[PDB]
Design a binder for this molecule. Structure first.
Ligand code: HEC
Ligand code: HEC
Ligand SMILES: [Ca+2]
Ligand SMILES: [Ca+2]
Ligand SMILES: [Ca+2]
Ligand SMILES: [Ca+2]
Ligand SMILES: [Cu+2]
Lengths: 106, 106
């Protein structure tokens, strides 16, 4: 899986969560999102292609996924406790971090 | 202070940060925003005034201010590091979290 594949996993599983009817369904999608986020974190995006791998921009790109995973982990906490509505609200917090990374790096 | 006053403080201090030039001004404005958000978290918005104090909507409302306060902390860290422009960009990025809560409860 390359960066664009991971991004499709992220987008698709956001829909699953929004449509979910129980917290286990939210947990399964969040689990897939966690794996796609850590895979994506290893990639170099086209826009940063001609910068150093140790560049500040690349570290800021990679840290964006750390914060996304932190939010995914926080929602997994709620999902694993049967709190489907609260886990769905927690997953809604991801959207702004999707947007903020894209603004700078997509 | 009441909810609307706290929102005025968040709104006006975002514009202060936009127009500042040095770290002290950005940190001072971010500090006021942090306290206003922590106070707002205690409020009941008009759209939820006939809800139960533990309803999922009030949970969601309160959790939005936890999220916002954490990102103000991140911008405060950048200001304390002398990265004025990075902190101004982080402050402008708060607007997405503001909008998220608004779409639901403003
Ligand atoms: C940086 C830290 C990112 C975060 C967090 C998220 N995304 Fe992303 N996204 C990022 C880049 C660099 C790119 C460009 C990849 C490229 O090769 O051009 C993208 C792109 C997308 C796309 C389009 C995929 C494509 O085929 O081009 C989608 C649908 C997408 N991103 C969705 C998405 C969602 C829903 C996110 C949050 C859960 C999210 N992304 C986070 C960088 C980053
Ligand atoms: C919920 C988690 C919120 C977050 C985060 C932010 N705001 Fe907000 N805002 C919220 C509510 C419930 C309301 C309605 C208050 C009411 O009594 O009607 C508002 C309203 C505003 C307003 C309008 C103020 C007015 O005209 O009376 C502004 C200008 C505003 N909010 C700004 C704002 C900013 C700049 C925020 C982030 C930096 C922000 N809000 C976060 C709920 C929530
Ligand atoms: Ca369904
Ligand atoms: Ca990784
Ligand atoms: Ca008003
Ligand atoms: Ca918290
Ligand atoms: Cu966040």
């Amino acid at each position: 899986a390359d960066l664009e594949d991971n991004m499709e996993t992220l987008n698709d599983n956001l829909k699953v969560i929004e449509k979910a009817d129980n917290a286990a369904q939210v947990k399964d999608a969040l689990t897939k999102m966690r794996a796609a986020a850590l895979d994506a974190q290893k990639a170099t995006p086209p826009k940063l292609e001609d910068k150093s791998p140790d560049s500040p921009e690349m570290w800021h790109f990679r840290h964006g996924f750390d914060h996304l995973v932190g939010h995914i982990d926080d929602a997994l906490k709620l999902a694993n406790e049967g709190k489907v509505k609260e886990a769905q609200a927690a997953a809604e917090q991801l959207k702004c971090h999707c947007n903020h990374c894209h603004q700078h790096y997509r």
